[PDB]
Design a protein around this ligand. Structure first.
Ligand SMILES: Fc1cccc(CSc2ncnc3[nH]cnc23)c1
Length: 167
């Protein structure tokens, strides 16, 4: 039993809700919140810009030190950093950005990072400003993640389409 509330159950392990991931994180304080990161951990917009803003830029400060030490992530890769005031940990996951020409096949590799964590609050990877089809992202999530994932979908219209079209 966990503290996530109001989710529709899609499969044994995947759940979905129309919610703002920032407000959802502030309420649940999950062990892991997933960020829709880029390889430079530059949290300018989309989910990343919103999560970072909610931390009063502390996420960005921590991220800049991480990059200065370790260099950029790989597309499809991840790193674990602090969750600041939102969660215990933030798993920064880089899905392919279609608006940069990146291989959509890397979306499965990106979701594989979720399997290192028993429970996560997450957005749909590569959706939104990353340019991929969210219906496809949900399919890859369900077919790749085996741990318990609670997906927050900000746009109510998109949420209804994802549910109604789910196989
Ligand atoms: F549109 C809104 C309305 C309320 C709050 C936010 C910030 S969080 C966010 N931003 C972008 N994509 C997302 N997918 C899941 N959560 C998010 C955005």
């Amino acid at each position: 039993v966990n503290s996530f509330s109001g989710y529709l159950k899609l499969t044994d392990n995947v759940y979905i809700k129309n919610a703002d991931i920032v407000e959802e994180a502030k309420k649940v304080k999950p062990t892991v919140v997933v960020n829709a990161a880029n390889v430079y951990l530059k949290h300018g917009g989309g989910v990343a810009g919103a999560l970072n803003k909610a931390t009063n830029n502390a996420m960005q400060v921590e991220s800049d030190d991480y990059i200065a030490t370790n260099g950029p992530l790989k597309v499809g890769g991840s790193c674990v950093l602090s969750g600041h005031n939102l969660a215990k940990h933030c798993l920064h996951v880089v899905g392919p950005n279609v608006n940069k020409g990146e291989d959509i096949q890397l979306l499965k590799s990106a979701y594989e990072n979720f399997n290192q964590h028993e429970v996560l609050l997450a957005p749909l990877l590569s959706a939104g400003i990353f340019g991929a089809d969210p219906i496809h992202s949900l399919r890859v999530c369900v077919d790749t993640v085996r741990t318990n994932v609670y997906l927050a979908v900000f746009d109510k219209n998109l949420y209804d389409k994802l549910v109604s079209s789910f196989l």
